[PDB]
C-alpha cells in the first residue's frame, strides 16, 4: 500500500469556504432601556442605590438596544441561588444549559442546512462550541442525535473557550475542510448566559459589566473546500489564520467555573490591550498580501463591548462605516460570545446582497475577522469575499 | 493575489507523523493489592462489609498492579467532602486539577521536546486534552506559559471528552500537521482522578468500578508532516481516522460535572457494545487497504477495563500477544483516560526497539489504535510503523 497515493486521494484542493450561515436566539427579548430596573428587582438589590446608578450608566453606554435571554422572570423566580451574587447554583445552571445549548444550536443548524440545500448525510464533520456548561456525552453528541446526522460524523467539542472562539471554530474548520476531500463541516456556536447570570455586588464591578453586555444566541455554518459550482453557493473563503496572546495581558479576562456558576474577572484594560495589539495582528495577516490600508478591507470584530470597537477605530483611523455590521449585531443582540462574529458575517453578507453590492464583503475583496477573549487571546481569520 | 498559489504554498505534503513521545505521572504510587483497605478506610466506609467485599473482587479482577495518584492520604484528610459519595466539592477539586493538569502535562511535554531535539520555538500548534476540570484561560494557556512556547502557538483546548479522546487528539493533530507546511504540533493529554474520586455507595456500583480502575498520568507527542531526514525521527505515521457512535448504546457511559464533582454512570454493557461493534470499525479502516487478518496488524486499544480487552480478543480470535502492550500499561498505570493509548504507543515502540524488532509496530507494517468513551463513541486511527 502506498501512503503517498492515499494522502493524495484523501485531501481537498481549494480554500475552505463558508457555504451557508444560519442563526437562532431564545424567544425572550429583553429591552436594554428597562434592564437596570428589571435586573435590580429580580436580584433583590433595589436598596443598592449607588450600585444601581453605576449599572444604569453601564447599560446606557453599552450601545445594546436588546438581547435575547433563555432566562426569564419565571425561571429566575424559581432559582434564587442564581439571582444571588454568589450562591451554590451550578447544578441548576447546568440543568438549564445542557438542554438549551443543543436546543438553540439545532435551530441555527437547521437554518444553515436548509440554505446549503444538500442532504444532511453529506455532513462529515461537526464542530460544536459553547462556554455554557459541560456534559458527557457533550453537546456535539446531543446535536448529532437531534439533527439525525450520520453516527460516524467526526466531532470536535469545544468547551469553555470564551468570547474568542468564533475565530477558533473557523481556524479549526479550515483545516478539516481543506485536508479532507469532500468534507463538509457543520459548525455550531451556541451561547447561553444562564451560566454567568448573577446578582450585583459593589466590590465586583467587572462581574456587573458582563450583566450589561452578554446575551444569548447560536449561529451555524457549513464549511467545505471545492464547492460544486451552481449547486453550492460560496459566501466567504478562508485564506489564513492566527491565534496569539497579547503581551502584558495576564489576567485581563479570567473565568472560573465553580459551585456558584461561571464568574468573570476583568483585571486589566481590555479595550486598551486589544487596541495596542491590533496593528501587529493586521500586519502579520496582511503584509504578506501586500495590503496596508485597513479601510480597504471588510471588517468583523468581536464586540466584547463598545469601547473595544471605539478604541480600535480610533487607533487605526477606520472610517465609521467599517464597524457597521459589527455594531448592528451588538445593538440588536448584545455580546453573544463565540457566536457573535458569525452573526456579524451573516449581517454583512445579507446587507451586501440586499443592497446590490459587488461582493459579500461590502463590495471589497479582502477582509478580516477577529475574536478576543481570555489569555488575552486574539484570533485572526483572513477572508476573501465572493462576487455577488 | 492568488488564493490557489497561497493554498499550494501553505500546505504540507506527507502523512502526519509522530516524532516524539514522553510520559509523566504523579509521584504517589498506589498498590492495587492493598487498595480496598485504603479506600474504605479513607472514605469512612469500613462498616459496609458486603460493599467492601464487592470492591475487593473488582480490584482483584482489574488486572491493574498499581496506579499513580495526585490524591494522597494527607490531601484526602483535608477534604472530607471529596471522600463522601456525594458532597459539595467541585471548588476543592477544581483548585487541585487546574494546577495539577498543566503541572503534570509540562513534565510529559518537556520529555517529548527533549526527544524531538528541535527548538520549542518551532512548535506551531498545541493540543491539550483533559477531562479533569475546566478553567479560563485553559490548560493550553497554562502550558504555553509554563513551557515558554511562542505566544502565537495555535491552541486547541479539548475539555471534558473522556476516555476516548486519545484517539480524538490524534485525529485532530493529523489534519493540523498535514494541511500546514512546517507545522509541528505538541499534543498533551493530562488526566487526574481528583475530579472523580468519591466514597462508595451500594446502590451505585457503576461509580465504584471507576474507583478500581482510574489512575493519573500525562503523555505528550510531537506530530508533524515532512520530517527532516536524520534530524527528526519518525515513530509512527497516521494514515486514516474515524469516529463513530455505536448503535444501541445510549447512556452506556455518561459523566456529569456537578457541585459534587464529576460522576460517571454506566447504564449498559460496555465490553459487549465495544466487542459487537469492533469488527465494523476494523472493516471500515482496513477493507480499503486490502487487509482482513486482524492478527497481521499491531494493536493499541483503550483499556477502559480488562473485559473490553478480553471480549475483543475473543470476538476476533486475536492471539494473546496482540494486547500485550495495552495490558502492560493497564497493569502498571490503570486506566488513565485520554493519555492511556499514548502510553501504549510509547510502550509498543520502546519494547519493539529494545528487543531488536524490524519496525516500531512489533515488526508489523500496519496497526490500529482505538479509543472508547461516552456516546458510546469509538475512535479509530490507522497507523503505519517505521523501520527500526
Coordinates of N, CA and C in Angstrom, one line a residue, chain A residues 86-257:
Chain A
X86 N -23.4 35.3 44.8 CA -22.6 34.1 45.0 C -23.3 33.1 45.8
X87 N -24.0 32.2 45.2 CA -24.6 31.1 45.9 C -24.5 29.8 45.1
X88 N -24.4 28.6 45.8 CA -24.3 27.3 45.1 C -25.5 27.2 44.1
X89 N -25.1 27.0 42.9 CA -26.1 27.1 41.8 C -25.7 26.4 40.5
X90 N -24.5 25.8 40.5 CA -24.0 25.2 39.2 C -24.9 24.1 38.8
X91 N -25.4 23.2 39.7 CA -26.3 22.1 39.2 C -27.6 22.7 38.5
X92 N -28.2 23.7 39.1 CA -29.3 24.3 38.4 C -29.0 24.9 37.1
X93 N -27.8 25.6 37.0 CA -27.4 26.2 35.8 C -27.1 25.2 34.7
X94 N -26.4 24.1 35.1 CA -26.0 23.0 34.2 C -27.3 22.4 33.6
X95 N -28.3 22.1 34.5 CA -29.5 21.6 34.0 C -30.2 22.4 32.9
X96 N -30.1 23.7 33.0 CA -30.6 24.6 32.0 C -29.8 24.5 30.7
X97 N -28.5 24.7 30.9 CA -27.7 24.9 29.6 C -27.4 23.6 28.9
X98 N -27.3 22.4 29.6 CA -27.1 21.2 28.9 C -28.2 20.8 27.9
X99 N -29.4 21.4 28.2 CA -30.5 21.2 27.3 C -30.6 22.4 26.3
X100 N -30.5 23.6 26.8 CA -30.7 24.8 26.0 C -29.6 24.9 24.9
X101 N -28.3 24.6 25.2 CA -27.3 24.8 24.2 C -27.6 24.0 23.0
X102 N -27.8 22.7 23.0 CA -28.2 21.9 21.8 C -29.5 22.3 21.3
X103 N -30.5 22.7 22.1 CA -31.8 23.1 21.5 C -31.7 24.3 20.6
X104 N -31.0 25.3 21.1 CA -30.8 26.5 20.3 C -29.9 26.3 19.2
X105 N -28.8 25.5 19.4 CA -27.9 25.2 18.3 C -28.6 24.5 17.2
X106 N -29.6 23.6 17.5 CA -30.3 22.8 16.5 C -31.1 23.8 15.6
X107 N -31.7 24.8 16.2 CA -32.5 25.8 15.4 C -31.6 26.5 14.4
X108 N -30.4 27.0 14.8 CA -29.5 27.6 13.9 C -29.0 26.6 12.8
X109 N -28.6 25.4 13.2 CA -28.1 24.4 12.3 C -29.1 24.0 11.2
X110 N -30.4 23.8 11.6 CA -31.4 23.5 10.6 C -31.5 24.6 9.6
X111 N -31.4 25.9 10.0 CA -31.5 27.0 9.1 C -30.3 27.0 8.1
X112 N -29.1 26.7 8.6 CA -27.9 26.6 7.8 C -28.0 25.5 6.8
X113 N -28.5 24.3 7.2 CA -28.6 23.1 6.3 C -29.7 23.4 5.3
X114 N -30.7 24.1 5.6 CA -31.7 24.4 4.6 C -31.1 25.3 3.5
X115 N -30.3 26.3 3.9 CA -29.7 27.3 3.0 C -28.8 26.5 2.1
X116 N -27.9 25.7 2.7 CA -27.0 24.9 1.9 C -27.7 24.0 0.9
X117 N -28.8 23.3 1.3 CA -29.6 22.6 0.3 C -29.2 21.2 0.0
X118 N -28.1 20.7 0.6 CA -27.7 19.4 0.4 C -28.1 18.5 1.5
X119 N -28.1 17.2 1.3 CA -28.5 16.2 2.3 C -27.7 16.3 3.6
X120 N -28.3 16.2 4.7 CA -27.5 16.3 6.0 C -26.6 15.1 6.2
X121 N -26.8 14.0 5.4 CA -26.0 12.8 5.4 C -24.6 13.1 4.7
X122 N -24.4 14.2 4.1 CA -23.2 14.6 3.5 C -22.3 15.4 4.5
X123 N -22.9 15.7 5.7 CA -22.1 16.4 6.7 C -21.1 15.3 7.3
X124 N -19.8 15.6 7.2 CA -18.8 14.6 7.6 C -18.1 15.0 8.9
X125 N -18.2 16.3 9.3 CA -17.5 16.8 10.5 C -18.5 17.8 11.2
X126 N -18.4 17.8 12.5 CA -19.2 18.6 13.3 C -18.3 19.3 14.4
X127 N -18.3 20.6 14.4 CA -17.7 21.4 15.4 C -18.8 22.0 16.3
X128 N -18.8 21.8 17.6 CA -19.8 22.5 18.4 C -19.0 23.3 19.5
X129 N -19.4 24.5 19.7 CA -18.6 25.4 20.6 C -19.6 26.1 21.6
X130 N -19.3 26.0 22.9 CA -20.0 26.7 23.9 C -19.2 27.0 25.1
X131 N -19.5 28.1 25.8 CA -18.9 28.3 27.1 C -20.0 28.2 28.2
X132 N -21.1 27.7 27.7 CA -22.2 27.5 28.7 C -22.4 26.0 29.1
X133 N -21.8 25.6 30.2 CA -21.8 24.3 30.7 C -21.0 23.2 30.0
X134 N -20.9 22.1 30.6 CA -20.2 20.9 30.0 C -21.0 19.7 30.4
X135 N -20.9 18.6 29.6 CA -21.5 17.3 30.0 C -20.9 16.2 29.1
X136 N -21.1 15.0 29.6 CA -20.6 13.8 28.8 C -21.7 12.8 28.5
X137 N -21.9 12.4 27.3 CA -21.5 12.9 26.0 C -21.8 14.3 26.0
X138 N -21.1 15.1 25.1 CA -21.3 16.5 25.1 C -22.4 17.0 24.1
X139 N -22.4 18.3 24.0 CA -23.4 19.0 23.1 C -23.3 18.6 21.7
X140 N -22.1 18.1 21.2 CA -21.9 17.5 19.9 C -22.7 16.2 19.7
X141 N -22.7 15.4 20.7 CA -23.5 14.1 20.7 C -25.0 14.5 20.6
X142 N -25.3 15.5 21.5 CA -26.7 15.8 21.5 C -27.2 16.4 20.2
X143 N -26.4 17.2 19.5 CA -26.8 17.8 18.2 C -26.7 16.7 17.1
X144 N -25.8 15.7 17.2 CA -25.8 14.6 16.2 C -27.2 13.9 16.3
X145 N -27.6 13.6 17.6 CA -28.9 13.0 17.7 C -30.1 13.8 17.3
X146 N -30.1 15.1 17.8 CA -31.2 16.0 17.5 C -31.4 16.2 16.0
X147 N -30.3 16.4 15.2 CA -30.4 16.6 13.8 C -30.5 15.4 13.0
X148 N -30.2 14.2 13.5 CA -30.1 13.0 12.7 C -28.9 12.9 11.8
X149 N -27.8 13.5 12.3 CA -26.6 13.3 11.5 C -26.1 11.9 11.5
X150 N -25.2 11.5 10.5 CA -24.7 10.2 10.5 C -24.0 9.9 11.8
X151 N -24.0 8.7 12.3 CA -23.4 8.3 13.6 C -21.9 8.5 13.5
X152 N -21.3 8.4 12.3 CA -19.9 8.5 12.0 C -19.5 9.9 11.6
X153 N -20.3 10.9 11.9 CA -19.8 12.3 11.8 C -18.6 12.4 12.8
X154 N -17.6 13.1 12.3 CA -16.3 13.3 13.1 C -16.5 14.6 13.9
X155 N -16.6 14.5 15.2 CA -16.9 15.5 16.1 C -15.8 16.2 16.9
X156 N -15.9 17.5 17.0 CA -15.0 18.4 17.7 C -15.7 19.2 18.7
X157 N -15.6 18.9 20.0 CA -16.4 19.5 21.0 C -15.6 20.6 21.7
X158 N -15.8 21.8 21.5 CA -15.0 22.9 22.0 C -15.8 23.6 23.2
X159 N -15.4 23.2 24.4 CA -16.0 23.7 25.6 C -15.1 24.8 26.3
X160 N -15.8 25.7 27.0 CA -15.2 26.7 27.9 C -14.0 27.5 27.3
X161 N -14.1 28.0 26.1 CA -13.0 28.8 25.5 C -13.3 30.3 25.6
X162 N -14.6 30.6 25.6 CA -14.9 32.1 25.8 C -15.2 32.8 24.5
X163 N -15.2 34.1 24.7 CA -15.6 35.1 23.7 C -14.7 35.1 22.4
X164 N -13.5 34.5 22.5 CA -12.7 34.5 21.2 C -12.8 33.2 20.4
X165 N -13.4 32.2 20.9 CA -13.8 31.1 20.0 C -14.6 31.0 18.7
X166 N -15.3 32.2 18.3 CA -15.9 32.2 16.9 C -14.7 32.2 15.9
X167 N -13.6 32.8 16.3 CA -12.4 32.7 15.4 C -11.8 31.3 15.5
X168 N -11.8 30.7 16.7 CA -11.2 29.3 16.8 C -12.0 28.3 16.0
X169 N -13.3 28.4 16.0 CA -14.0 27.4 15.2 C -13.8 27.5 13.7
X170 N -13.5 28.8 13.2 CA -13.2 29.0 11.8 C -11.8 28.4 11.5
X171 N -10.9 28.7 12.4 CA -9.5 28.2 12.3 C -9.5 26.7 12.2
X172 N -10.3 26.0 13.0 CA -10.4 24.6 13.0 C -11.1 24.1 11.7
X173 N -12.2 24.6 11.4 CA -13.0 24.2 10.2 C -12.1 24.3 9.0
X174 N -11.3 25.3 8.9 CA -10.4 25.5 7.7 C -9.6 24.2 7.4
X175 N -8.9 23.8 8.5 CA -8.0 22.6 8.3 C -8.8 21.3 8.1
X176 N -10.0 21.1 8.7 CA -10.8 19.9 8.5 C -11.3 19.9 7.0
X177 N -11.7 21.0 6.5 CA -12.3 21.0 5.1 C -11.2 20.9 4.1
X178 N -10.1 21.5 4.3 CA -9.0 21.6 3.3 C -8.2 20.4 3.2
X179 N -8.1 19.5 4.3 CA -7.3 18.4 4.3 C -8.1 17.1 3.9
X180 N -9.4 17.2 3.7 CA -10.2 16.1 3.5 C -11.2 16.3 2.3
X181 N -10.9 15.6 1.2 CA -11.7 15.6 0.0 C -13.2 15.3 0.3
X182 N -14.0 16.2 -0.1 CA -15.5 16.0 0.1 C -16.0 16.4 1.5
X183 N -15.1 16.8 2.4 CA -15.6 17.0 3.7 C -16.5 18.3 3.7
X184 N -17.5 18.2 4.5 CA -18.5 19.3 4.7 C -18.7 19.4 6.2
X185 N -18.3 20.5 6.7 CA -18.2 20.7 8.2 C -19.4 21.5 8.7
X186 N -20.2 21.0 9.6 CA -21.2 21.8 10.3 C -20.6 22.4 11.5
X187 N -20.7 23.7 11.6 CA -20.1 24.4 12.7 C -21.2 25.1 13.6
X188 N -21.3 24.8 14.9 CA -22.4 25.4 15.7 C -21.7 26.1 16.9
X189 N -21.9 27.4 17.0 CA -21.6 28.1 18.2 C -22.9 28.4 19.0
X190 N -23.0 28.0 20.2 CA -24.3 28.2 20.9 C -24.0 28.7 22.3
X191 N -24.4 29.9 22.7 CA -24.0 30.5 23.9 C -25.2 31.0 24.7
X192 N -25.3 30.6 26.0 CA -26.4 30.9 26.9 C -26.0 31.5 28.2
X193 N -26.4 32.7 28.6 CA -25.9 33.4 29.8 C -26.5 32.8 31.1
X194 N -27.2 31.7 31.1 CA -27.7 31.1 32.4 C -26.5 30.7 33.2
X195 N -25.3 30.4 32.6 CA -24.2 30.0 33.4 C -23.5 31.2 34.1
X196 N -23.6 32.4 33.6 CA -23.0 33.5 34.2 C -23.9 34.5 34.9
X197 N -25.2 34.4 34.7 CA -26.1 35.4 35.3 C -25.9 35.3 36.9
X198 N -25.9 36.5 37.5 CA -25.8 36.5 38.9 C -26.1 37.9 39.4
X199 N -26.4 38.1 40.7 CA -26.8 39.4 41.3 C -25.6 40.3 41.3
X200 N -25.8 41.6 41.6 CA -24.8 42.6 41.7 C -24.1 42.7 43.0
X201 N -22.8 43.1 42.9 CA -22.0 43.4 44.1 C -21.1 44.6 43.9
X202 N -21.1 45.6 44.8 CA -20.4 46.8 44.6 C -18.9 46.6 44.6
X203 N -18.3 45.5 45.0 CA -16.9 45.3 45.0 C -16.4 44.5 43.9
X204 N -17.4 44.1 43.0 CA -17.0 43.3 41.8 C -17.8 43.9 40.6
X205 N -17.4 45.1 40.2 CA -18.0 45.8 39.1 C -17.6 45.2 37.7
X206 N -16.5 44.4 37.7 CA -16.1 43.7 36.5 C -17.2 42.7 36.2
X207 N -17.7 41.9 37.2 CA -18.8 41.0 37.0 C -20.0 41.7 36.5
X208 N -20.3 42.8 37.1 CA -21.5 43.6 36.7 C -21.5 44.0 35.3
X209 N -20.4 44.4 34.7 CA -20.3 44.8 33.3 C -20.8 43.7 32.4
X210 N -20.4 42.5 32.7 CA -20.9 41.3 31.9 C -22.4 41.2 31.9
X211 N -23.1 41.6 33.0 CA -24.5 41.6 33.1 C -25.2 42.6 32.2
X212 N -24.5 43.6 31.9 CA -25.0 44.6 30.9 C -24.7 44.3 29.5
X213 N -23.7 43.4 29.2 CA -23.4 43.2 27.8 C -23.7 41.8 27.3
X214 N -23.7 40.7 28.1 CA -23.9 39.4 27.5 C -25.3 39.0 27.2
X215 N -25.4 38.4 26.0 CA -26.7 37.9 25.6 C -26.6 36.5 24.9
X216 N -27.7 35.9 24.6 CA -27.8 34.6 24.1 C -28.0 34.5 22.6
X217 N -27.4 33.4 22.0 CA -27.7 33.1 20.6 C -26.8 32.0 20.1
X218 N -27.3 31.5 18.9 CA -26.5 30.4 18.3 C -26.3 30.7 16.8
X219 N -25.2 30.3 16.2 CA -25.0 30.5 14.8 C -24.4 29.2 14.2
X220 N -24.7 28.9 13.0 CA -24.2 27.6 12.4 C -23.7 27.9 11.0
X221 N -22.7 27.2 10.6 CA -22.1 27.3 9.3 C -22.0 26.0 8.7
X222 N -22.0 26.0 7.3 CA -21.5 24.8 6.5 C -20.2 25.3 5.9
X223 N -19.1 24.6 6.1 CA -17.8 24.9 5.6 C -17.3 23.8 4.8
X224 N -16.8 24.1 3.6 CA -16.2 23.0 2.8 C -15.3 23.6 1.7
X225 N -14.3 22.7 1.3 CA -13.5 23.1 0.1 C -14.1 22.5 -1.1
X226 N -13.7 23.0 -2.3 CA -14.2 22.5 -3.6 C -15.7 22.5 -3.7
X227 N -16.3 23.7 -3.6 CA -17.8 23.7 -3.8 C -18.2 23.3 -5.2
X228 N -19.4 22.7 -5.2 CA -19.9 22.3 -6.6 C -20.6 23.5 -7.2
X229 N -20.0 24.0 -8.3 CA -20.4 25.2 -8.9 C -21.9 25.2 -9.2
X230 N -22.7 26.2 -8.8 CA -24.1 26.3 -9.1 C -25.0 25.4 -8.3
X231 N -24.5 24.5 -7.5 CA -25.3 23.7 -6.6 C -25.0 24.2 -5.2
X232 N -23.7 24.4 -4.9 CA -23.3 25.0 -3.7 C -23.0 26.5 -3.9
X233 N -23.1 27.3 -2.9 CA -23.0 28.7 -3.1 C -22.0 29.4 -2.0
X234 N -20.8 29.5 -2.5 CA -19.8 30.2 -1.6 C -20.3 31.6 -1.2
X235 N -19.9 31.9 0.1 CA -20.2 33.1 0.7 C -18.9 33.9 1.1
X236 N -18.0 33.2 1.8 CA -16.7 33.8 2.1 C -15.7 32.6 2.0
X237 N -14.4 33.0 1.6 CA -13.4 32.0 1.6 C -12.4 32.3 2.7
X238 N -11.9 31.3 3.4 CA -10.8 31.5 4.5 C -9.5 31.3 3.8
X239 N -8.5 32.2 4.1 CA -7.2 32.1 3.4 C -6.1 31.9 4.4
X240 N -6.1 32.4 5.6 CA -5.0 32.4 6.6 C -5.6 32.6 8.0
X241 N -5.0 32.0 9.0 CA -5.5 32.2 10.3 C -4.3 32.4 11.3
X242 N -4.5 32.9 12.5 CA -3.6 33.1 13.5 C -4.3 33.1 14.9
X243 N -3.5 32.8 15.9 CA -4.0 33.0 17.3 C -2.8 33.5 18.1
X244 N -3.0 34.5 18.9 CA -1.9 35.0 19.7 C -2.3 35.5 21.1
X245 N -1.3 35.5 22.0 CA -1.6 36.0 23.3 C -0.9 37.4 23.5
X246 N -1.7 38.4 23.8 CA -1.1 39.7 23.8 C -0.1 39.9 25.0
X247 N 1.0 40.6 24.8 CA 1.9 40.9 25.9 C 1.2 41.7 27.0
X248 N 1.7 41.6 28.2 CA 1.2 42.4 29.3 C -0.3 42.3 29.5
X249 N -0.8 41.1 29.4 CA -2.3 40.9 29.4 C -2.7 39.9 30.4
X250 N -1.7 39.4 31.2 CA -2.0 38.4 32.2 C -3.2 38.7 33.1
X251 N -4.2 37.9 33.1 CA -5.4 38.1 34.0 C -6.3 39.2 33.4
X252 N -6.2 39.6 32.2 CA -7.1 40.6 31.6 C -8.6 40.0 31.6
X253 N -8.8 38.8 31.2 CA -10.1 38.2 31.2 C -10.0 36.8 31.8
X254 N -10.3 36.6 33.1 CA -10.3 35.2 33.6 C -11.8 34.8 33.8
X255 N -12.0 33.5 33.8 CA -13.4 33.0 34.1 C -13.3 31.6 34.7
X256 N -13.9 31.5 35.9 CA -13.7 30.2 36.7 C -15.1 29.5 36.8
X257 N -15.2 28.2 36.5 CA -16.4 27.5 36.6 C -16.5 26.8 38.0

